[PDB]
Structures are given as structure tokens and as C-alpha cells.
Amino acid sequence: SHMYLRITNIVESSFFTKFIIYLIVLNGITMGLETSKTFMQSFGVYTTLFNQIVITIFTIEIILRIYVHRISFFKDPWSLFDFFVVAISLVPTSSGFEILRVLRVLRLFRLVTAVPQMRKIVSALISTIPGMLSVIALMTLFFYIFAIMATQLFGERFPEWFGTLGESFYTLFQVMTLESWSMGIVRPLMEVYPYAWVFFIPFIFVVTFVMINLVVAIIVDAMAILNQKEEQHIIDEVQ
Amino acid sequence: SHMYLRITNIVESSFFTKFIIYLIVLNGITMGLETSKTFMQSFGVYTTLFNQIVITIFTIEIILRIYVHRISFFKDPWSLFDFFVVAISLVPTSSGFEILRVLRVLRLFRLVTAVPQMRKIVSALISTIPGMLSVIALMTLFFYIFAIMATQLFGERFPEWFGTLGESFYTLFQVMTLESWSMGIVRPLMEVYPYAWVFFIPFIFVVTFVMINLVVAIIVDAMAILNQKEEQHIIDEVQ
Amino acid sequence: SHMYLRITNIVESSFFTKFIIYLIVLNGITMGLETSKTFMQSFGVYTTLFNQIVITIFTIEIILRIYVHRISFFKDPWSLFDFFVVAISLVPTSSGFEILRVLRVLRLFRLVTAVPQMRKIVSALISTIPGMLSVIALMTLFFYIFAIMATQLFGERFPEWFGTLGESFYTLFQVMTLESWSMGIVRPLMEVYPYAWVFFIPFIFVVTFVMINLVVAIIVDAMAILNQKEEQHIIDEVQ
Amino acid sequence: SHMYLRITNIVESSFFTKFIIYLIVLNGITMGLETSKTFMQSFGVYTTLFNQIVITIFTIEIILRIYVHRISFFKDPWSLFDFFVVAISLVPTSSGFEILRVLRVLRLFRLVTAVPQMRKIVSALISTIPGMLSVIALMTLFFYIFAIMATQLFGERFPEWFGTLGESFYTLFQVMTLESWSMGIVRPLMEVYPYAWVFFIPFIFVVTFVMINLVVAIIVDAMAILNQKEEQHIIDEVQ
Ligand SMILES: CCCCCCCCCCCCCC(=O)OC[C@H](COP(=O)(O)OCC[N+](C)(C)C)OC(=O)CCCCCCCCCCCCC
Ligand SMILES: CCCCCCCCCCCCCC(=O)OC[C@H](COP(=O)(O)OCC[N+](C)(C)C)OC(=O)CCCCCCCCCCCCC
Ligand SMILES: CCCCCCCCCCCCCC(=O)OC[C@H](COP(=O)(O)OCC[N+](C)(C)C)OC(=O)CCCCCCCCCCCCC
Ligand SMILES: CCCCCCCCCCCCCC(=O)OC[C@H](COP(=O)(O)OCC[N+](C)(C)C)OC(=O)CCCCCCCCCCCCC
């Protein structure tokens, strides 16, 4: 085309991404100083302006990127993310939900989607999640079953920790982290239900024994592959 | 046969397992809402009925499965488990042991034995336990020896933590998890027995150094096997 | 010889080790019941007798084993251990050091030296220690340097935690375990010395980063060996 | 040359390093006794003298080493370190910064730079840091983004923990270590902001899931290399 390809050469240019990566870091320092109320009393409106500027520059950048990339933009996770963290940044501060004014900061994660060094890492870390979804399901069911049981056993005399399935979910996650599991939870529990240890010591055993085997499988299974991709390139040459 | 093979085609069918997996998830949501007393005041008897229904459907399912599978049912762990978690579900609520009304929830673990994706994981995780039984024994003896020693050294001035072999077992397990081992246990201990650190710092060292080597062996030993199953398939082809 | 070889066939026999392994387990149950004062009020002297019996049986067993094994007994760690844990068991209860009456229990560790299944594990776990001694030295020096620094920085306003090199050693080990390192130690420290985080956050970083690399090296280095013992058996056959 | 090569043979000699390694250990014991005020009341000035001696001996040693090694001394990290930890040791005790009198102890780290066994380890541990710098950056950005968010969400009602970006940095690091993350931080937070768990449970998930994959990558990636350096030496011989 003509106007399309004129835009495309700008969007796909190094200066464009450099300019965005530039603005991202500039806004990043802006949001960190925005925490200090000394700075907000002094250089206050300077940054609300400079924030409102970058938001529209990012909307323009997203609009241009949509015209260039067409359906592929809405099938790219890094683009879909960039879309949503600016869409969040666009909903005005006026609402009965001031938490969206805090979700503004997620637009600093653009420095991941914009810098290909970070994307490579983030992709590598996420790439382990697919196989773990099956083990994640077993653990989530395990948690749900014990959270039912704990709510029924302990939620009566211990409402804060167990009086509700959601609380027992939180508390059991705290037991998984071993955070004050004994002194803070099980030992007070045992002052009323002496056999509560029969519930939690196995829970700590299963939960831990799975987390370990999850990591062990991640290592040993990833490397039977390299031990067969080598087992193949060696039989390649003797034939 | 005739009536046997008529049953077998039903039990071994996809609809049968699908229908059980269906009921399992339905009962799973039932038990989670059963925790809320708002729901139990409203839709209360709806779920006691629907529970009593699924229990008999499961007994029928187990009865049918026993007639089909014969001795192999009572030699299959997944079947033996399904047997016991429904047998637990059958003992009536009337007893001086209301904990069996809570063990009802273990029938949600049927979703493991019924969904072959989960069974594959559970089998993989359990498959590491066999070799660990030898190291588990050494640790359990190590614990027993120190639990004797700790009960004799500290159980006098510190009954809650050490006044009994069982308590010293629990406390030493808490020291293994490092849960408040210093601020909560050893530091108060040292206010009376200044050399208590001579007992626990080595205990933390041995217990940790074994747990690490247990995991390291799980990895390195699992993969000398893949490094010899490859060492074999390479000598295969040069001869 | 004549009387020598008559003894040797007994000592080296299966019944002899079986009889010792038997007595060890019997004494093991004895010491566990010896903790209960209900049992000691009832079956009390029964076990002091039965203990005094096993001690001499073990001395006889050690004496016989010394005559058979000659200098090799005092060059065998399992024998040297069996020697010392019975020698400890022989020093009479009368002393201004009643802790030796508790070290009696270490004679339950004979079940390790007597059962070859356990010895194999204990040997495997200890076999990692040799290479770690070099990294252990660096960490022990690292601890000593910071324990000097912490005693000088914090031992004034905080004697319990840091008022002495030994206490700073203990406290720093507690920081290594992350046991209440922030809420219990560094946060109170920062109420007086606001930059104490500059001391401990790096200490947590170095200490952790070494522990991880210690384990990583244990795995990756153990398995370049299996990756070259295979690299050798493959070049073996193509020549 | 003449005077140059006369110095060089001394500096590069075994006695020279031995004499320094000697003095280092001697000063190491000196600084440990210097903590005891009983010792400082008695043998006090003995060690201030002996310290002032070793400092100049080390300056001489550094001066000689600079004349020998020329530009290579100021391009060697072990030398650059030895330079700085003695330069720190030279700034006189008189200042409004008595912390430099504590940084004297870093001259005990010379025993690392002087003993080639330690240098080999320290080099091996540091050698993992290069590849981790990319993942370290992602985590440091992740921390910065959430530390902004936490300061804005919680710093109002919770100034000690979150009232400042620096405090939220410290607190989030404490949550990463799981040190009292629930009982000490999130549970008090939830007494005011009930959905604070929506902030921290994911933070614990991401932070942990990265730390694990960081270690897993360190292992699995280090050993595709040994699995291709072997994959190469095997194709070497079949051609
Ligand atoms: C998108 C990527 C962008 C990357 C940008 C990286 C650099 C960001 C720098 C931001 C600096 C913000 C400093 C700031 O707000 O300081 C707040 C507080 C001081 O609060 P304040 O109320 O001013 O103190 C008043 C003191 N008084 C009473 C004596 C008048 O003081 C503090 O909180 C202490 C200073 C904390 C600095 C934390 C720096 C974190 C760097 C993270 C780098 C990540 C790179 C990926
Ligand atoms: C066999 C497999 C079956 C899988 C089924 C998965 C889905 C199960 C859903 C169960 C939902 C149960 C909800 C429930 O009971 O909520 C209890 C509490 C509310 O208690 P409630 O007393 O009603 O609150 C009264 C409030 N008031 C005063 C204003 C009137 O509120 C809470 O506790 C908050 C909601 C917690 C939801 C936790 C969801 C966990 C999902 C785990 C999924 C595992 C998949 C394998
Ligand atoms: C050399 C290898 C030998 C291996 C031997 C393994 C078996 C050892 C069994 C020892 C059993 C000792 C039982 C015992 O002393 O119990 C103490 C306490 C009860 O104290 P007590 O003062 O009698 O309670 C009075 C109750 N009252 C007021 C109602 C009258 O009750 C408790 O503490 C509860 C029971 C704790 C049992 C712990 C069992 C640990 C097994 C470890 C196995 C390791 C195998 C390698
Ligand atoms: C460059 C490498 C050099 C390596 C040198 C290794 C050896 C260093 C030995 C230093 C010994 C220092 C002993 C010391 O200052 O003890 C301080 C305190 C006692 O304080 P003090 O105020 O004398 O107690 C008075 C008692 N009263 C009231 C009854 C009169 O008592 C304690 O703190 C207890 C003793 C703690 C000893 C800690 C030993 C750590 C060894 C680390 C080895 C690392 C090797 C790389």
C-alpha cells in the first residue's frame, strides 16, 4: 500500500521501540518518585501531566501497532498484554474503584514486552508451566479436599483460621510455606484438638513431597530429551 | 457368560466412568457449599439426600466392579482405595466418632482414581517412595534417638515441647522444618540449658544434609540410568 | 590357630550379628519406654538390669571383635564408632556430668553399623562431605568475619543476639535458616541502627547463593563423570 | 632489570605468600579476641600495635606487588580487592564514620585471595552470576513494580512495613524469604484490606517459581553442554 507501508516502516523501526523503551523507563522513574509526598507537594502536577502524555503516546503506539499487525496483534500475548495494561491505564481515576489507579503501574511491565532480552526469559519461565498444569491440578484438588476437612474440624473453635473454606485455603497455603505452621497454627489447634497433628504433619508431607518431585521431574525429564537428542545424533553418523 | 458379560460391557464402558466422574465433580461442589451454613439453612436437606444418593450409586458401582474384576479388584490399589473411601462413607453418622462424617470427603479423591491423567501423576510421585524407604528409615531412627535424648534433657523444665517422647517427636519435626526453631524453641531452651545449641545445630545439620542428598540422589541416580540406556543404544549400532 | 579360629567363626557368624541386631532393637524399645515415668514406677528396675546386661554383652562383643580383627578393628570407622558408643555407655552414672547417662542412647546407632543396608546409605551421604569441605571452609570463614563485624556493630545495644562472638555466630546461623531473620532480628535492629539491612540482606544473599551452588555443583559435577564414563565406553567400541 | 627482578623473585616466592597467609591467620585470631573486652582490658594495646604492624606490612606487600605486576595488578580482581581492603584499613580511626574501623575485618578475606584453593571456589560460585544477571533484572523490576503498588495500597495504614518504597522493598524481600509473611504481615494487612491476599499470594508464586526455574536452568543448561561436548567427542572417532 501507501499510507499503510508508511506507518509500518515507522512502527517496525528501531527508533520506535527505542522511543517506547525510553518513555517506559522515564515513566518508571516517575512512578517511583510519585510515591514520595515531598516530591508530590513540589513537582506534583509535572508528573500527572507527564503520565497523561505517555498514556496517549502508548494508545497511539497501540493503535498504530494494530493497523500494522492486523489479526496477528490480537493473537500475540505480548501485544495482548500491552493492550490490556494501557486499557487499564485509560479508565479514568473517577470511580468507586481507586485500585485501577494503582494498576497503572503494570504499564512498567511493558519493559518486558519491549526488550527482547526479557521476553526470552519470561518465555523460558512460562514454558515450564504447561507440563506442570497436571500436577497443579492434583495439588489444587488436594488443597480443596483438606480445606473442606479443616473447615469442618477446626472452623468452629478457630474461625479466623478455618471458619470458612476460603480461610482454610489461605491457612493451608500458609502451612505449605511452613510459615508459623506449628507455633502459630497447629500448636494452638492442639490445645483444643490434640490429634490435629494427624491432619497437618501428613499435609506437610504430601505437599512438600509433591513440590520436590515437581522440581525433580522438571530437571530429570528435561534432560532425558537432551540425552536422546544426543542418542540420535550419535546413531546418525554410524550409518 | 450372559449376565456377566452384559454387566461387564456397562462397567467397562466410557459412559460409566464418565457418569462417575460426573457425579464426583457434582458431589465435590456439593461438599464445598455444605461448609456454608447460610447454604445449609436454605438448601440443606437437598444435599444430604444428594449425598446419600451418590453413596449408594458408588456402592452399586463398586459392587458391579467387583463382580466384573473378581480377585483383580482386590489386588488393584486404585480399586482398593475406591473401596475404602466408600466403605468409610457408609458407616452411619451415629457414633461416638463424628470424624468419620468428615472422612466422607476422601471420596473426592475418586477423581484421581477415575481420571487416568491424575493416576499417571500419582503413580509417578509414589514411584520415588520405594528407594527412599531406606533413607526414610535412617531418618526415623535418627529422630527416635534424639527424641529420647531431648525428652530426657529438656522435658523436665519444658514439658509442652519435650515432656514426652511424642512431644519431642513433634518438636523435632518442627525443628526440621526450621519453624521458629531458634526464637521459639532453642533460644528459650538456652535460657536454662546454655549448651542446648550443641544439641539442635547438629540436628539441623544432619536432618538438612540428608534431605538435600535425598533429593540429589533422586536426580543423579535417575539419570545414570538414562545415561546407560543411551550408553547401550549407541553400542547397539556399532556392532 | 585353634582358640582364635574358634572365636572367629562365632564373631563372623550370622547368628552373632543377628543376636546383636536383636539386642539393639530390644534395647531400643527399652529406652523409649524408659522415658515414661509411669513405666519407670512399675517396670523400673527391670530395664536398668536389662540395660546393664546389654552393655556387658556389647563389651564382650567388642572384646571378641578386637581379638578377631586386630589392628583392622581400630582402623574401621564403624568399629571405632561401636567402640566409643559402648565406652560412653560404660562410664558409671556417678559423676558431676549426668549428660553421659543420656549419651547412652547413641548405642542405638549400632543398628546402623550392624545392618549393612543402613551402612550403605550412611556411606553414600558421608561420601559427599569430602568435596564440600572446601566450600564449608569458605562459609565458616565468611561466618567468622561477619560474626566479628556483627558483634562490634550490634552487640552493644543488643547483647543477647550479638554481645559476644559466639552469640553472633548463633544469630547469623539463625539468619541463614531465615528463622525470624526480619521480624525477630533485623527489624528490631533497624529501630536503632537503620542501615542494619545493609549488613544482613547481603549476608542472606551470599549465604543462600552459596548453599544453592553447593547443591548444584553436587549434581552437575557428579554427572559429568557419568557423562564421561559413558563418553569412554562409546569410544571403546569404535576402535 | 636489576632491582626490579630482585624484588620480583621475593614477591613471587612461596615464602612471601606463606608469610602473608601466616600474618592473615595471626591477625584473624587477633580480631576474634579483640571482641572480648576482658582480653582488651588485659592484652589490649598488644593488638592495636600488632594490627598497625600488619597494615603497613600489607601496604608494603601491595606496593611491592604493584611494582612487579604493573598494569596487570590494577586489572586483577583479587589484587584490586586486596588493594581496597587495605586502603579501607588505612583511613584513620578518627572520623565521624566509625564504621570504617569495623570494615578493617574485611582484610581477613585476603585469606581467600591468598590461598588458591579458596580462589578456585569463589571463582566457580561467581561464574554462575553472569547468566543470572538477566533473570536478576526481571526480578528486580518485578520487585520495583510491586513495591510501588504496595506502598500505594498499604503504606497509609501500615507505614512501618509499606509507608515508603524502600520499606516496601524490604518487606517484599521478607515475603520472598517467607519470613512471617502471613502471621506477621499479610494477616494483619487483611484485618484492614481483606483482599491483600490477592496481592501477596501471587507475589509469593511468581517470586518462588522464578527462583526454582533459576536453579533448574543452572543445572539443566550447564549439562546440555557436557551432553554436547560428549556428543562431539563421540562423532570425533567414527570419522
Ligand atoms: C520501568 C523501569 C524503571 C526503572 C527505574 C529505576 C530507578 C527508579 C528510582 C526511583 C526513586 C524513588 C525515590 C523515592 O521516591 O524515595 C522515597 C523515599 C523518600 O521519601 P520522602 O517522603 O521523600 O522522604 C522525606 C524525608 N524527609 C522527612 C527528611 C524530608 O526514599 C526511598 O524510598 C529510598 C530510595 C528507594 C530507591 C529504590 C530503587 C529501586 C531500583 C529498582 C531498579 C529496577 C530496574 C529494572
Ligand atoms: C471433586 C472435584 C470438585 C471440584 C469443585 C470445584 C469448585 C467448588 C466450588 C465450591 C464453592 C463453595 C463456596 C462456599 O461454600 O463459600 C463459603 C464462603 C461463604 O460462606 P457464607 O457463610 O455463605 O458467607 C455468608 C456471608 N454473609 C454473612 C454476607 C451472608 O465463601 C468462601 O469460602 C469463598 C469461596 C471459596 C471458593 C474456593 C474454590 C476452590 C476451588 C478448587 C478447585 C479444585 C479443582 C480440582
Ligand atoms: C534401635 C531401634 C529401636 C526401634 C524401636 C521402635 C519402637 C519404640 C517404641 C517405644 C514406645 C515408647 C512409648 C512411651 O514411652 O510412651 C510415652 C508417652 C506416654 O507417657 P506416660 O507418662 O506413660 O503417659 C501417662 C498417661 N496417663 C497420665 C493417662 C497415665 O506416650 C508417647 O510418647 C506416645 C507414643 C510415642 C511412640 C513413638 C514411636 C516412634 C517409633 C520410631 C521407630 C524407629 C524405627 C527405626
Ligand atoms: C583469617 C582466618 C583466621 C581464623 C581464626 C580462627 C580461630 C579464631 C579464634 C578466636 C577466639 C576468640 C574468642 C573470644 O573472643 O571469645 C569471646 C567470648 C568470651 O567473651 P569474654 O567477655 O572474654 O567472656 C568473659 C567471661 N567471664 C565473665 C566469666 C569473665 O567467647 C566466645 O565467643 C566463645 C568462643 C567463640 C569461638 C568462635 C570460633 C570460630 C572459628 C572460626 C574458624 C574459621 C576458619 C576459616
Residue numbers in the entry:
A (entry chain A), B (entry chain A), C (entry chain A), D (entry chain A): 999 to 1237
Please share text taken word for word from the publication where this structure appeared.
Structural studies of the homotetrameric bacterial sodium channel NaVAb showed that these four homologous domains come together to form a functional channel with an ion-conducting pore at its center.
These results indicate that NaVAb/V126T is a valid structural model for this IEM mutation. The crystal structure of NaVAb/V126T at 3.1-Å resolution suggests that the V126T side chain forms a long-range hydrogen bond with the side chain of the Asn211′ residue in the S6 segment of a neighboring subunit. The V126T side chain rotates almost 180° from the Val side chain in the WT structure, twisting around the axis of the Cα–Cβ bond to reorient the oxygen atom toward the Asn211′ side chain with a distance of ~3.4 Å while maintaining van der Waals interaction with the side chain of Ile216 on S6. In the WT structure, Val126 interacts with Asn211′ through van der Waals interactions with a distance of ~4 Å. The V126T mutation changes the chemistry of the interaction to a hydrogen bond while preserving the volume of the side chain and the hydrophobic interaction with Ile216. Mutations NaVAb/I119T and NaVAb/V126T give two-component Boltzmann fits of their activation curves, as if the voltage sensor activates in two steps. Remarkably, the biphasic activation curves were resolved to approximately single Boltzmann fits with this protocol, confirming that biphasic activation curves were caused by the short times available to reach peak current in the standard G/V curve protocol.
